[PDB]
Amino acid sequence: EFQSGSCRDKKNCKVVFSQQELRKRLTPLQYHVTQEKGTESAFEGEYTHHKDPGIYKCVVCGTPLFKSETKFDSGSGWPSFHDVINSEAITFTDDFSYGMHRVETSCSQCGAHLGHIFDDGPRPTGKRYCINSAALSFTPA
Amino acid sequence: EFQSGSCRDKKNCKVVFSQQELRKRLTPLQYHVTQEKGTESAFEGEYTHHKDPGIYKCVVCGTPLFKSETKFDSGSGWPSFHDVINSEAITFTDDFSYGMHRVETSCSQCGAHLGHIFDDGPRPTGKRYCINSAALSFTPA
Ligand SMILES: [Cl-]
Ligand SMILES: [Zn+2]
Ligand SMILES: [Zn+2]
């Protein structure tokens, strides 16, 4: 159960940035993914096969999102995680694009589009997060 | 364990087609996928969310490849099957593109590129055949 929509949809993001700042700080791909609900090409993401210990953060606002301990590589075209660093970090939206229903995931502080979540992950959580590398930055442990 | 290479690599395909014939018959996308080892964009394939009972065949030569009973949908960008219709239908090749090791799958009869096989699949096989929709045709039951 969840109220559907990003904090941009709900008009209540805690963190905001000017477009001038966003355009000069983000690459065009990072901007398109996080600001226009884009998806990075499969197998081209910088963090798809990254295994270093550390924390993945929102590329836009720097809020921590995922711990390296929860990352796994099984052959998906994009980074995959078992769990979010804490329940407050991500917001959910019902997504009906491409002729299917998915649950889209966004940063709860600035509203950046991140990826999608699926209900078929192993225990304990039962979840699997498919996340665009272009939506993340990485801080080594 | 397998000898690596398509029947084109091994110079022993049972069936061959003229390249003018193939161009007339296949769309540019089907040609690029099957003849140039291409990959279709995620979520755009005709059979990605297809559920009708029947049999999927090689789009080039017509050989049966997959039964609808083995198809599953876990949210992948491409059609997913857990087993091939018979052990002789598909040939395997070690593939090192995109900074990865994958096992590429091709039609044993004509050498057409189909997709890849992974070890992250469900029981009973543990295998996921990740197959481009553009490499397939479908015959309803
Ligand atoms: Cl893609
Ligand atoms: Zn953010
Ligand atoms: Zn064939």
Residue numbers in the entry:
A (entry chain B), B (entry chain A): -3 to 137
Recite the paper's sentences:
Two main classes of methionine sulfoxide reductase (Msr) enzymes catalyze MetSO reduction to restore the unmodified methionine: MsrA enzymes reduce the S epimer, and MsrB enzymes reduce the R epimer. MsrB1 has an active-site selenocysteine and is found in the nucleus and cytosol. Both MsrB2 and MsrB3 contain active-site cysteines, but MsrB2 is present in mitochondria, and MsrB3, the focus of this article, has distinct splice variants targeted to mitochondria (MsrB3B isoform) or the endoplasmic reticulum (ER) (MsrB3A isoform, hereafter referred to as MsrB3). As anticipated, the MsrB3 structure has the characteristic Mss4-like fold found for other MsrB proteins, consisting of two highly twisted, short-stranded β sheets. The cysteines Cys3 and Cys9, in the CX5C motif, were found to be disulfide bonded to one another adjacent to the zinc-coordinating site and far (∼21 Å) from the active-site cysteine, Cys126.
A truncated version of MsrB3 was then produced, spanning residues 1–137 of the mature protein. This version was crystallized without reductive methylation in a different crystal form, also with two molecules in the asymmetric unit, and diffraction data were collected to 1.71 Å resolution. Molecular replacement using the initial MsrB3 model was used to phase the new crystal form. Truncated MsrB3 also contained additional electron density in the active site. Based on previous observations that crystallization in the presence of cacodylate buffer can result in modified cysteine residues, together with inspection of simulated annealing composite omit maps, the density was modeled as a dimethylarsinoyl modification, in which the arsenic is bonded to the cysteine sulfur by displacement of one of the oxygen atoms of the cacodylate. Ser72 and Ser76 coordinate a water molecule instead of a sulfenic acid in the dimethylarsinoyl-modified form. A comparison of the active-site regions of the two crystal forms shows good superposition of all the functional groups that are in hydrogen bonding distance of the sulfenic acid or bound water molecule. Only the region around Ser70, which forms hydrogen bonds to Ser72 and Ser76 but is 4.0 Å away from the sulfenic acid, is altered in the dimethylarsinoyl-modified form due to a local and minor change in loop structure with a maximum backbone displacement of 2.7 Å.
